[PDB]
C-alpha cells in the first residue's frame, strides 16, 4: 500500500491531486489527470 488520489472528477475535466510513494521520497502533483478506473503501481526486475 503506498499512495492516494484525491479529486472532484478524476477525468481531466478539472484538476486533481496525486500522491505517490516508493522505496525512498514521495511525489505530489495536482493536474488534469485522466485516471484509470483502477489506478495502481507495478514495480518489477527490468533485465536491461
Amino acid at each position: 500500500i503506498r499512495g492516494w488520489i484525491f479529486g472532484t472528477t478524476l477525468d481531466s475535466k478539472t484538476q486533481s491531486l496525486l500522491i505517490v510513494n516508493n522505496a525512498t521520497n514521495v511525489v505530489i502533483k495536482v493536474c488534469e489527470f485522466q485516471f484509470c478506473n483502477d489506478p495502481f503501481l507495478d514495480v518489477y526486475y527490468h533485465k536491461n
Binding site: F6, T14, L17, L41
Partner: protein, 48 residues
C-alpha cells in the same frame, strides 16, 4: 481553505487485534495548498 493537511503515526502492536484499545496521537508531517475542490479519493496498491 484550499490547504491540504497530512498528519500521521506508526506504532508496534502485539497480536491481540488491529486498531487496539489504548492511545497515540498523529503528528503533522506534510502541508500543501492545492487551491481546489476535493469530493472523492482512492489508494495505490503495489503489485510485484
Amino acid at each position: 481553505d484550499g490547504y491540504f493537511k497530512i498528519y500521521s503515526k506508526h506504532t508496534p502492536i502485539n497480536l491481540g487485534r488491529d486498531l487496539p484499545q489504548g492511545f497515540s496521537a498523529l503528528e503533522p508531517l506534510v502541508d500543501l495548498p492545492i487551491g481546489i475542490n476535493i469530493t472523492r479519493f482512492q489508494t495505490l496498491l503495489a503489485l510485484h
